[PDB]
Symmetry: C3
Subunit: 97 residues, 3 copies
């Protein structure tokens, strides 16, 4: 529980788009962990980033839980893809349990 | 030692306000750990963020120490509250020791 | 492998300078780990930061590897110094293996 997903991305998003993403990401971490939505934190922050030999769209995710896993990965990645259009092969997730 | 607090927040702050916060946070990590101020790092960076069902003011803190704990938590949180006005129930801290 | 260096700095850089840094940092994490460049992620993001009693130029690095070390440190730091002019004594690196 106390689940939290902080995303670092080079996507071009407006603030309102980031807010929509975070709220949605919060409901996704809720379903995925069964803790209530009221305890889920999500953040997105911009960064200049490369992955391989290009600066094409990519994302790094820090996931935190106080405490069986590719369930969370597909869920977090699909959320990223739905909001920023990032290819899943350009999304790294760090589990900090 | 080598204590470091990196804060991700959706607070609206000017650069000079962030600098004041970081310097003050450095003296707080100093008192709290007894390492000298010269070795304390603090950072604040903006992010779009939600906690629960709102984007109201919240903060995530990554604390690092090369190496008995709610002493650090209350201290870091009270600093955040003094500078950004964040409610303590909207502050998550990650201890990375 | 899956090596990734995310940098938080208070350096004043243009976006194109950050991109150059990230691409170069990717080739450096490649040499250093022998994984291919195609799997290396680097990011730089701005932050207001203090180290000691000043807000002079400093950097925090989160290094991640799925998995003998000051080889990576000197390499990452020298890259930071070549691009942002940060003094090596103002660069903290966190190894998250
Ligand atoms: Cl979604
Ligand atoms: Cl204070
Ligand atoms: Cl270089």
């Amino acid at each position: 529980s106390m689940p939290c997903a902080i995303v670092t991305t080079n996507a071009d998003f407006t603030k309102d788009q980031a807010d929509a993403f975070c709220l949605d990401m919060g409901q996704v971490l809720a379903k995925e962990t069964g803790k209530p939505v009221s305890y889920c934190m999500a953040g997105v922050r911009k960064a200049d980033m490369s992955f391989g030999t290009s600066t094409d769209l990519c994302c790094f995710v820090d996931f935190y839980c106080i405490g069986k896993n590719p369930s969370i990965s597909a869920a977090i990645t699909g959320c990223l893809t739905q909001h920023f259009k990032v290819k899943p092969e350009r999304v790294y997730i760090s589990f900090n349990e």
